């Protein structure tokens, strides 16, 4: 269930509400400023890191479950979504239908959105690929 959730359901949740559009009306008293703006932020592919921890000073290192139990940390991994930004402009002629065009401000760009706690021995976990001697090295019971 956890591998299904990480591999497929996270991307589905991202894609269900990926597009976020805010239409800024012209609000023009005079016809000099008859331009309307439409700003679109869209989420793309979601990426999951290996489990990790950031300390107080900002140094981030790979976290293994033995260390997370001893230091009372959370065995989690970061989520990074691709965000593309769209800016659209249209000449606000009353009666005429608005036709938006890109101003070529299509800046895009992984952005950190949170830390998903990782189930142990799942595909994202370090212990899934570990052999018995590797588990003994990490002070994990096989």
């Amino acid at each position: 269930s956890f591998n299904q959730f990480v591999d497929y359901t996270l991307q589905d949740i991202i894609c269900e509400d990926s597009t976020l559009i805010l239409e800024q009306l012209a609000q023009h008293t005079t016809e000099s400023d008859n331009i309307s703006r439409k700003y679109e932020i869209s989420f793309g592919k979601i990426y999951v890191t290996k489990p990790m921890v950031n300390e107080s000073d900002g140094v981030t290192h790979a976290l293994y479950p033995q260390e997370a139990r001893l230091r009372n940390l959370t065995y989690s991994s970061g989520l990074f979504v691709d965000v593309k930004k769209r800016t659209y402009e249209a000449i606000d002629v009353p009666g005429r239908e608005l036709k938006y065009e890109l101003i070529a401000e299509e800046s895009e760009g992984k952005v950190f959105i949170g830390r998903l706690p990782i189930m142990l021995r799942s595909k994202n976990c370090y212990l899934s690929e570990a052999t018995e001697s590797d588990l003994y090295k990490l002070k994990e019971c096989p």
């Binding site: 559009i21 805010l22 239409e23 800024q24 009306l25 609000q27 439409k38």
Partner: peptide
């Protein structure tokens, strides 16, 4: 007086 910004579904 017109709303400056609005949500677009």
């Amino acid at each position: 007086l017109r709303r400056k910004t609005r949500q677009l579904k």
